[PDB]
Design a protein around this nucleic acid. Structure first.
Ligand SMILES: [Mg+2]
Ligand SMILES: [Mg+2]
Lengths: 487, 12, 232, 485, 248
DNA sequence: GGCCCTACGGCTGAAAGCCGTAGGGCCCTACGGCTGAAAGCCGTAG
């Protein structure tokens, strides 16, 4: 049954199919949780499996397989590699995986295999999954309908801005830098307080509270144009540099010691690129290059220079011809309502806060539904405490369990649910301390239901709940700025 | 590894 | 007629028919799929050439690299015709060249990388319609069973967990009898035949999609994406 | 810095490696007929749920749970181990059910771990039957965090049904497979004749186990080797393929069957390498006309100046079209390696089945006595129901209710708690008589269980009944046919 | 002195050399596994410690005819990293590292690999044992993760039960759930662990390989490693019985 | 035994590769017993 199909239509259909699939579901972060699908599905597979911080580490193969079989039908190669990048403190400003074992280094030094490493969620990753079981995010069936998976994660801190994201898609390519957590919290606190501000009022506020990127690798940002260009337009270009100190040898010689380097600069490739320009003799002022970095002092590259050479000139030449100075090319692309968008800083803040409020409103509704259920049961239980002797009589004189059920509905004014509760109730609960705990649990739940209806009714309180929960988080988990900013 | 039992008594 | 192996590519399971007219080269997304194909094929007529991964993009790559890519060499040899000016349709070893790439989205992408090779490097093979695409199913909704060829056609078919929906991420998840009956049994399969109507409209499309102009590719994607479902 | 003599080190280390390979990698336990890697894949599968009532799980999840919890070696050689158990040209009674590309009888490798799917087979469920009833010793795993079975209940003679094969240090084992029904006839003997001796039993089993039965069919040629192996633990069993001559004006040789463990691709290559050498003339051409619909079919047109019998016998000679399975019945018994006769294998498996059923009955008894000692305190609470309800209501806490419950009646803390936890549902009319009736039924069962533990005659009976259930449902016709020479 | 690869080498590729040029202060760790070699490349003292990792099992040089052995890339790598030469051509003056540490898992397959390693050294390079250059590094078996204080490492269940008892009795506190990490090989260790337990000279636990009698070693090697299966079978059957009682 | 080839975008700075998700690979060794005269087959392990 041959079916002729023109080549222009097939190229168009198949290549746009590939491109949309790469753009919306592989390479680009979703704006609310900061996560490409692979990150979402790995960390959900871990959460659902138990590999929390409370429990002990579980071999990576178990997370890689659980992910591949229930959520992510791709190769175990790249899933392991993704999980690993999430565990490295030089790759994520706020790592979401707690790895045990050789997970690599800043250099060409590779990570150990999947069978030797163990891995579990970090406490921040648990903030990413806080109350995900309270119908706070939309769930959809996985590739084969056997289970359900999150569409987005609660993301109770702003992941996308905290850890960045970098992704080559088709036709576009995102590259958002990370930021310092305490700062982003200030920006969000503003955006919650001034919920009404027009876009440019908001933009100026966040821009002044979010002084700039905070790379896991520390180092230096030089000047402010690129950063401003990035947050105003979503595209900028941010000059970064590493840190050099000058040392004076016992015998008058001087040396240059590199201790920090720009973000995503491979240490091995950098030492190789200096040595291959004294060997090709275009970077003079150097005489040897010794790599004294050990796991106990951290990075420590020592460059000894000629006595007929000036420290600051060789330094500026290193800035120009190596990556001791390189530009982070910001391009702030992200998925909003399933479409790609280049976003300004105020948009990355408002859209995240709007997600948090969706989350708290959904969470408060869920708790309210479940609380109404519980009070509808304890009210049918106090209605039977008051009328206890008639009840027990009816049941000790009913042929079946169904006859006693129908009789308890006839005898009070209650559901089949309240009756069924009554029959399912243990005798251990007929002591006096327990019959009191029942009336009191009703008192407590009606107080709580009041509070929840209040919340759902005042957006002031909703915003206030976001503020106070995120301030708890920042205080347990915020850290100092690593990357130093200058002019 | 000592040469006891074999049938009866299993192998030791 | 043409000789079949017992110089041809290392990885080629060849057919044992000497008449190219009645023969078929099934081209496949790596070794694990090549396996199920070689087991479930009809060895008299069907040959199987597995390729490792995403083949090199020819439109972005200078021609001399393209010809050192081992999989490209495998393809040129397996067909025999030669390329470009030296092309000799007389030397064609199979008169159906079937592209069987994994039913998933990355298989559509491999399909495009390959139609690009065949258009820039053996365009008459497409002119005379010797190039096909096979439709290995992505999904077996078991229920009177039924098969689905993309993440979307699954939900229309479940609307219209115990071995029910079964995803075929490659041909490697497929045991030979199912791959025989869905894609390769000439008596029930549905092959799709590549045709060429405007060569110039075709030529410009390939430059736009596969080439180095990412500024022209972006604008094409954003101008024709929302409107792809409606090309019929 | 302490010194060490090279002699002492080489000795301590090589002995530790060799004993570890002998007892825990290469050689099968005699009861369940498994190496560790097999026992741990089957057990992680079971524990994970991948049973035949449920959808095939991605084959990466079984490897991950096996290596994570039980078997700390490489995913590669655990995937291969699992894959072999699902090839039906490798297991006469396969224990893994495979969806996907699991190899072929030749050199087609299996699809990578990420592509295939895998679950347990019904027989493999019978290797695990009632493993949750204290039917086998468990020991802590490689990190104490969970526990693993030392052996599986193996409710069928897996070691003989499926063979084993393995290279260790200083030795090596090669037990062929066998027909499950024949093995069950021999086990039935050893049960009806439990007091009989070794001469007699070896006679009877050798007479019900006519020999190996291979998944690949073929033929066994000669009765001697079969008999050597069964009588002394070692023996050389010659197998043959099946040739089907067919007469365009051309006369051909169609191979449809081969001996167990003969690679189909390496076979063709050996014919073609000995016709390239030119030391098997008489062949016009070799053509694998083989496919999933026709099965094995290697048609071999022969010259019109060559005869069929002559060339067939040349092939028997120079190729593996006939070739010799060299058994060395060797297994681990009570922790040590032992070559064994067919009477020592059957008997050792049988003793295992009896062990398993007296252990399961011990477990069932203890749990029955638990539930009865509870039920007795409940019915004592029913005969004095008004006193007990009034007592609780008048109590202040639940501990005070409990103390008063033990005062009123003569019950334990287990029994008082079981009355306290008792739900109102059970104080209905039909439910109180359900409690009574239940106490009665459970005391009946308790009697049956005591009775089984007293009478070995009964324990052998339960083995015969349950294994025939199994063999009727899962046994099959003999494949390899037996001829003489 | 000797030159170490840096950019110009002339040495094995898997080798990660040391900066120091003086063999009397340099050490080569031959390490089972590329994961474990990689994480020893990071943990080392780059000044003095070089790393040659080994894919798994080495070629048995006593069963294997001399010709296949020199064509074997891993053996050729171990030879080139030592500078000396093999058989009669051997020269201890050209030795590249005056301590050779064999570091393999504390599992039976690391014993097999350290057995395939000491067979090679003894047949191709006997003098390196005779002079006490060849050591064995004892990996740890447990990490004890005290809460408030530094972790401790333990190299035997005896030491683990002693350190757990002593710390708890000192008022230190330990989680039941994730509190004591049992290692099953070197690949499970990060670079800091590998340093703090098998590479730092001041807490290392090495064992110097000596040679009392080169003639009963000759027959021992012949028995265990060679092609005479019966001699092996008999040797294991004679000596397995008394493995639990050799040090009483 | 992690190390290899692809796509994909944007930087550099001018011809490649780096970066992070995806498609797909490569095959050394020990061990015992074979057949056949060396050797590699087979099944669990690094
Ligand atoms: Mg190990
Ligand atoms: Mg040998």
């Amino acid at each position: 049954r041959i079916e002729p199909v023109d080549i222009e239509q097939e190229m168009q259909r198949s290549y746009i199919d590939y491109a949309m699939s790469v753009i919306v579901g592989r390479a680009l972060p979703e704006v609310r949780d900061g996560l490409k699908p692979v990150h979402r599905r790995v960390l959900y597979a871990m959460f659902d499996s138990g590999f929390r911080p409370d429990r002990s580490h579980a071999k990576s193969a178990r997370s890689v397989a659980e992910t591949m079989g229930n959520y992510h039908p791709h190769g175990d190669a790249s899933i392991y590699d993704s999980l690993v990048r999430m565990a490295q403190p030089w790759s994520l400003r706020y790592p979401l995986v707690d790895g045990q074992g050789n997970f690599g280094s800043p250099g060409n030094d590779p990570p150990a295999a999947m069978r030797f490493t163990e891995a579990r969620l970090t406490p921040l990753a648990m903030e990413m999954l806080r109350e995900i079981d309270e119908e706070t995010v939309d769930f959809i069936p996985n590739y084969d309908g056997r289970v359900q998976e999150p569409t987005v994660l609660p993301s109770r801190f702003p992941n996308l801005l905290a850890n960045g994201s970098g992704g080559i898609a088709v036709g576009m390519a995102t590259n958002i830098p990370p930021h310092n957590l305490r700062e982003l919290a200030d920006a969000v606190f503003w955006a919650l307080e001034n919920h009404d501000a027009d876009e440019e009022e908001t933009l100026a506020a966040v821009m002044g509270r979010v002084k700039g990127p905070d790379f896991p690798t520390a180092g230096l940002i030089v000047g402010s144009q690129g950063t401003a260009d990035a947050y105003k337009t979503g595209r900028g270009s941010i000059r970064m540099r590493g840190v050099v100190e000058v040392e004076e040898d016992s015998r008058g010689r001087t040396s240059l010691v590199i201790t920090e380097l720009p973000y995503q600069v491979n240490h091995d490739n950098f030492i190789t690129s200096i040595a291959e320009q004294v060997r090709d003799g275009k970077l003079a002022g150097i005489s040897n290059i010794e790599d004294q970095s050990s796991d106990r002092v951290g990075l420590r590259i020592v460059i000894e220079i000629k006595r007929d050479a000036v420290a600051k000139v060789v330094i500026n030449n290193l800035y120009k011809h190596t990556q001791l100075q390189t530009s982070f090319g910001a391009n702030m692309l992200a998925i909003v309502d399933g479409v790609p968008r280049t976003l300004r800083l105020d948009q990355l803040i408002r859209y995240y806060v709007d997600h948090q409020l969706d989350v708290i409103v959904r969470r408060t509704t869920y708790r309210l539904r479940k609380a109404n259920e519980r009070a509808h049961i304890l009210r049918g239980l106090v209605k039977a405490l008051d009328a206890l002797d008639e009840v027990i009589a009816l049941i000790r004189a009913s042929e079946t369990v169904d006859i006693a059920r129908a009789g308890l509905i006839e005898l009070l004014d209650i559901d089949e649910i309240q009756a069924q509760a009554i029959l399912d109730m243990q005798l251990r609960r007929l002591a006096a301390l327990e019959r009191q705990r029942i009336i009191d649990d009703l008192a407590k739940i009606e107080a709580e239901i009041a509070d929840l209806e209040d919340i759902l009714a005042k957006p002031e309180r909703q915003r206030g709940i976001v503020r106070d929960e995120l301030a708890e988080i920042v205080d347990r988990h915020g850290d100092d700025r690593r990357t130093r900013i200058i002019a | 590894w000592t040469x006891t039992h074999x049938x009866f008594g299993x192998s030791x | 007629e043409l000789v079949r192996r017992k110089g041809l590519p290392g990885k080629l399971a060849d057919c044992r028919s000497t008449d190219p007219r009645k023969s078929e080269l099934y081209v496949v997304e790596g070794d694990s799929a090549g396996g199920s194909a070689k087991s479930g094929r009809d060895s008299m007529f069907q040959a199987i050439l597995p390729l490792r991964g995403k083949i090199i993009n020819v439109e972005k790559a200078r021609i001399d690299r393209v010809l050192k890519n081992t999989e490209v060499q495998a393809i040129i040899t397996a067909l025999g015709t030669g390329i470009h000016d030296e092309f000799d349709i007389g030397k064609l070893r199979y008169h159906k060249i079937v592209l069987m790439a994994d039913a998933d989205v990355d298989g559509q992408h491999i399909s495009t990388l390959l139609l690009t090779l065949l258009f820039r490097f053996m365009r008459p093979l497409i002119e005379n319609g010797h190039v096909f695409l096979a439709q290995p199913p992505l999904y077996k909704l078991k229920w009177d069973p039924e098969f689905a060829y993309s993440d979307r056609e699954r939900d229309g078919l479940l609307e219209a967990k115990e071995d029910g929906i079964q995803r075929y991420k490659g041909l490697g998840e497929m045991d030979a009898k199912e791959l025989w009956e869905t894609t390769m049994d000439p008596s029930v399969r549905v092959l799709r035949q590549v045709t060429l109507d405007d060569a110039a409209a075709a030529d410009e499309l390939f430059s736009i999609l596969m080439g180095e102009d990412v500024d022209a590719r972006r604008s094409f994607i954003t101008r024709n994406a929302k409107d792809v479902r409606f090309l019929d």
